[PDB]
Design an enzyme around this catalytic site. Sequence first.
Site, PDB file in Angstrom:
ATOM      1  N   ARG A 153      -2.640   3.829 -19.456  1.00 31.47           N
ATOM      2  CA  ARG A 153      -1.528   3.713 -18.514  1.00 31.47           C
ATOM      3  C   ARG A 153      -1.652   4.747 -17.398  1.00 31.47           C
ATOM      4  O   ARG A 153      -1.405   4.447 -16.221  1.00 31.47           O
ATOM      5  CB  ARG A 153      -0.181   3.862 -19.221  1.00 31.47           C
ATOM      6  CG  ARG A 153       0.941   3.218 -18.417  1.00 31.47           C
ATOM      7  CD  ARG A 153       2.261   3.960 -18.508  1.00 31.47           C
ATOM      8  NE  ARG A 153       2.573   4.363 -19.873  1.00 31.47           N
ATOM      9  CZ  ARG A 153       2.761   5.618 -20.251  1.00 31.47           C
ATOM     10  NH1 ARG A 153       2.694   6.619 -19.381  1.00 31.47           N
ATOM     11  NH2 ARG A 153       3.017   5.877 -21.531  1.00 31.47           N
ATOM     12  N   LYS A 163      -3.105 -12.897  -3.267  1.00 27.83           N
ATOM     13  CA  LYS A 163      -3.353 -13.855  -2.190  1.00 27.83           C
ATOM     14  C   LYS A 163      -4.808 -13.743  -1.790  1.00 27.83           C
ATOM     15  O   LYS A 163      -5.698 -14.038  -2.604  1.00 27.83           O
ATOM     16  CB  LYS A 163      -2.366 -13.563  -1.049  1.00 27.83           C
ATOM     17  CG  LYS A 163      -0.908 -13.487  -1.525  1.00 27.83           C
ATOM     18  CD  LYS A 163      -0.396 -14.759  -2.195  1.00 27.83           C
ATOM     19  CE  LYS A 163       1.035 -14.496  -2.763  1.00 27.83           C
ATOM     20  NZ  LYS A 163       2.006 -14.038  -1.745  1.00 27.83           N
ATOM     21  N   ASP A 165       3.299  -4.223   4.969  1.00 25.44           N
ATOM     22  CA  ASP A 165       2.751  -5.255   4.088  1.00 25.44           C
ATOM     23  C   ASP A 165       1.697  -6.031   4.872  1.00 25.44           C
ATOM     24  O   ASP A 165       2.030  -6.837   5.755  1.00 25.44           O
ATOM     25  CB  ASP A 165       3.881  -6.163   3.602  1.00 25.44           C
ATOM     26  CG  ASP A 165       3.399  -7.214   2.617  1.00 25.44           C
ATOM     27  OD1 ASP A 165       2.195  -7.557   2.613  1.00 25.44           O
ATOM     28  OD2 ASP A 165       4.240  -7.674   1.820  1.00 25.44           O
TER      29      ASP A 165
END
Lengths: 380, 380, 380, 380
Positions: A47, A196, A171
């Site tokens: 983690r 994407k 973004d």
Amino acid sequence: MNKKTKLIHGGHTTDDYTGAVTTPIYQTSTYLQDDIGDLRQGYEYSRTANPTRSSVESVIAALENGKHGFAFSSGVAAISAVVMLLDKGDHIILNSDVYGGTYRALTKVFTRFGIEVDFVDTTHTDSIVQAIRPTTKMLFIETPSNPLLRVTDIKKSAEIAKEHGLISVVDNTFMTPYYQNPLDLGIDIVLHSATKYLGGHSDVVAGLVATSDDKLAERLAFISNSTGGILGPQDSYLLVRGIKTLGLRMEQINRSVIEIIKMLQAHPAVQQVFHPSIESHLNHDVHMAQADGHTGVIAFEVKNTESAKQLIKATSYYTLAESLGAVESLISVPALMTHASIPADIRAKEGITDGLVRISVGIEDTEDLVDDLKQALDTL
Amino acid sequence: MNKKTKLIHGGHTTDDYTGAVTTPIYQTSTYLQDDIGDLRQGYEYSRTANPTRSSVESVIAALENGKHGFAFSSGVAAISAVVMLLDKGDHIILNSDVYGGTYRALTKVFTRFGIEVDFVDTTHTDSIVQAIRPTTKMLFIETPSNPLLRVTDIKKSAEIAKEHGLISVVDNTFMTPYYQNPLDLGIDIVLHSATKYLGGHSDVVAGLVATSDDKLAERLAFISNSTGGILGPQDSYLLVRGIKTLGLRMEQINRSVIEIIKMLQAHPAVQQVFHPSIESHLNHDVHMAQADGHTGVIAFEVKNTESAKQLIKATSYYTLAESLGAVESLISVPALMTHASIPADIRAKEGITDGLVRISVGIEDTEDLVDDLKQALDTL
Amino acid sequence: MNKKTKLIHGGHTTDDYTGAVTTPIYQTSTYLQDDIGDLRQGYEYSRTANPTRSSVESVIAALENGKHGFAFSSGVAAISAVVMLLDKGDHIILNSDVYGGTYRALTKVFTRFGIEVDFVDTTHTDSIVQAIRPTTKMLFIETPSNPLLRVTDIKKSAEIAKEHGLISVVDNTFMTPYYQNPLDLGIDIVLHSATKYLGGHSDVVAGLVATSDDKLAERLAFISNSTGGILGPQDSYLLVRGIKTLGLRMEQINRSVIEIIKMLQAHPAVQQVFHPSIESHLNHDVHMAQADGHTGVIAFEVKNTESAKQLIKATSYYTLAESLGAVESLISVPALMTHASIPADIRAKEGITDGLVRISVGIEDTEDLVDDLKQALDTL
Amino acid sequence: MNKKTKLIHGGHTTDDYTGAVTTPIYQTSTYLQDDIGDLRQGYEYSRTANPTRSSVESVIAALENGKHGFAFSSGVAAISAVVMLLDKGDHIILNSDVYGGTYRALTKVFTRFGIEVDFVDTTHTDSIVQAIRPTTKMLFIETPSNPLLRVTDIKKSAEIAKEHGLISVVDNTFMTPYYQNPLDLGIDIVLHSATKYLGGHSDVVAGLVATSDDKLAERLAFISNSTGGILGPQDSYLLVRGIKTLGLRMEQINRSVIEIIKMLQAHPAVQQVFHPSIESHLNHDVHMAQADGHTGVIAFEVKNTESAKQLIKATSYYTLAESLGAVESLISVPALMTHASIPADIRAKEGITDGLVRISVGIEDTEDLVDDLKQALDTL
């Protein structure tokens, strides 16, 4: 390195130990220590850090010309970690048409923690300046936006943010690092839905963040380690693998975009076409100054809901689905899918008619894609 | 079904389509729609839902006798999603010795969003009652806790929470659903670091949450979809696979725990031994009333830091590493690893001496594990 | 190490480089060389060697007390590589009831390369001796066999092979290395369909071979590198992972086998029961001398095809499918599935009636499995 | 469909069940049957058929314009399955310089089964005719070959094979289906090391075979099911994924090949350059008639072993490794790596000098690749 070379050799994507030319997949949760606190190669608990995830983090930092990269379990998780840089009482400015998932998280989750939000038309930078409050701490912009591809001036936004003491965030999903590099224009943090274009194959959900600011990077690392929206090692590997072909994929997509737009502009069944390459598109000049290529998302209007529904049934190569950036071309109708919860009158005032169709251009043959969409339009 | 049968046949872990006896790995981000809004099997976008993740969610719901399951990218992400049920101004009560990762997130991240926290000795339920404020909304407890295995009365905590209008949450990582089922005792939400026993093989980082409350489940689903700390499909598959052997693994671990504790209690180099099976352990009776087995984590004291360091170097089968719940036995020294940032005087008052050693019993041969640790202790 | 410890710590299944406690998945085809011919860690091309495959090879060598292990893409590929030790003109002896896949490969493929085969009742070792020809080079035996669980004396077969100059091979799939170790009894080569018990989770197709003979190992390595039926790295990882729980899985299976057999022997709808634990089973004494546990495959007869078909529809926990060795219990009817191409009169003379049912006992609760099969039998 | 569209939409690579736009990874070994012999979707046992492997098989059949595809665990396994179409006593003709792995298998393994082989200069088709014997059954050719890129006339070879009653086989690895389609030229069987260009990312070992002949396909399927060198599901998925970008990758590689060859032909430290695009290359005309593009493998001579060793150390972007077809550019010296077991005098008569360097052009920027190799050559 030129861009196509950087996609292959930027970052660290080989195994120093065996010489393997690809990043090993460390499907592991913990690491043996020789002495207490002595980490063989700096890993202690996956983690906190995992070598496969560290590989994709180094790649996105390299491609955005940043110093530090972060990999999250989704684009939404990346956005959430960035918003968590703020405290209760802080305010954020975002573009008026921001992704529905960003919109949802901010207005329904983070408002409950005292973060206040305003959605501003950032295509006019004076509207940004007019919206800044004493408590504003962040300016968050997508460019180009969805589904109308509105363009916001990145360099001016970065200057406004610097002058007014705001963290600036872009973004950059729709343009990718191959064509637009917000960090080089003075933005503090760049982020992506790597689901994407970056992964590119419709087979990974992931978010990525990059920054050159050491202090913001330390804050992001602490948020990541404390809220744990980390990308797993198999998804990290597939993302590294997909990024290798990003330049070739975007160049093919861009060749098809040019021809598809030409066909749409001439077709009698199509009204407005929305894409930043179009000369009459608002802030076309801004886009060409801050990017050296184009997104593969195009929107265009047909007469009504019935024409859009029938357009989709008539295509051979456009897959009806959510998402974008895949090797397969995709098609959707925002008013029926992404924006259906918005009253139709408000949708229209926002520029989204019932006949607006969105396509994501894939890497199929350019002539095939143009001819397939043109013949489907001919049936209307 | 008896417990061992439920681990194999509980939930949905086969493919209805091909008959495959294992859950297919849906390494995919999006799903074709036949008509707009028509989802072939209810999937539209993998962040919202993915069939492999849906499989592991159905399993944890079944094993905890809940209705709804949720899979997150880590235990920390599960805890973060649960805490996000609250608003600025709300208060949470947690046990005094809560996991350092839970402690970090609450005191350094969520306090910045106006969530207030108090850490209470929940081994005396009157201390819980005395700590409840007008703004308290949640009671969050681990039992047994780390590293001293303190036991908290789950049923009484659930009654206190119900009477005072609090959401009750149990971190059930250390006991697993095989031995302790908080939802059956009236707790609202149960959660796990599935990184530990449930996956069981030290090769997945994951969190899981289960509840029977429809409204809390809707709130959790919205938080998950909006902040995006979702578990990927490969990790979801490995978690489903690991859970299949949970009963056998815990039964072997429990057989070894009994013999290891007997050896530790007789060894002249060992002072206190901490485990809920021990008759003199505080709330031993509470533990036996709410669980039908034991955790494999045991702590015990040797003289000092030098004896603990040398104990570890002298073992053959205990791996020096962070984490627990693996098939391999693990060993650590909390004062040097997990708690090293806490001043030594406070550590000691908290019951953690410099000589405290923690072991996580794995599934090696019981005699081998007892003999290996006993001979290492003999060198002190 | 005792057996359960060897399953966790035998072989090499950690990463020396990072300390990762699990074997990294080297999804790679080639390895950088620092100088020409200078292999950083001995790897040059994944078909010749891959670190994840090398891990599972070290494990099976350890578990069978051999020196060299080999991992193939299937059990059939392992058998094919072993048969390829021979030349045209050579002869092989196999047990009379050998696996249909072994039977198919030998009689339809390898006979075309001049390998001659005889199928012998190896439950009487004098029939082995009587079948050896001047050109015989190999003795290949399964014990116990499928579906009637016939037992062959391994030590005597090894002695016969040594005296007559034959390579001895045992297919040890049904017993696993946990209970039967042919190499320790003097057999030259041991092999497994690791698809069954070793992987254990119905999710890997794989073969494994082990030997202590350096020259046979060099011959096998050359065959493997030249015919290329290699196990991939993801499947190698899942196999290593599955093997960790082999001891616990087989011990649970063995507890259930005892009770299931007791119930079958008392049930009025069941005629003969076939399993090596049964006192009246031929070569029961041989089995108990060469193995310290049992297979989970049991066969038993009901009246006819109609009773077997209805028995299967009436169970809750037995999955109708091919294969065996899984965590889920499986059920089949050999006359309709595996042996349906054999004329019914020959099937019966071979001991396979139309009512013969085969079960593979999984790791469900023992009482559940006994009660479920008993109540299904009660409907007949 | 044009070629680039076929790479995305040829074959079956979506999930009919959920609509997933990528092929699910069926990490499974067996399939539930509703009634005995009733296969829900035609699957019963993953060695015989697995849906993920069936996907990649459909893709290679589509791309080669064949009817039937087969996926093997390596290129060597594909070749071995094809050779197993023959019987003891049969003879095969292969090109004189065939891949060392093909050469090894045929001369050291299959000769022991009575298959006889002759290696013929197939660049002159009269030498093929002169080598055919009464027992010849197969003609197997690579074009272009390694490392000198010799070209063999596919259409003439197919005509010779048809007239003389031979099965014709082309190893099409170096050209890929994107540029050369042997089945369309009358060849019976086409095969690939999919490890190279088709996977494209240096991270899968795999073989693929395609044919339009139903009877040969039935024979191949039986060989595959009987000798079991099957490709696993994870590797099948990565291969499908890699193939999506094959057209874009080969087009970038081809642009770089043109410029690299121009630079090599002008460089004073380079003697001969070997590539089929070169006008003076033997059978250049044959290559341009049977292929509409080029391989990315180029060989060229420098003075001696010392110049080749120093050339490699002086490059920035060429990775010293075995294999070819990757996104990263690769470099090797055949005399020291692949052909080092061949006496140096024979190597030279075969056209492989001590100074022969082989490169595999990747998808880096064309100018970067040309400039990097040119400046390294300048140091000689």
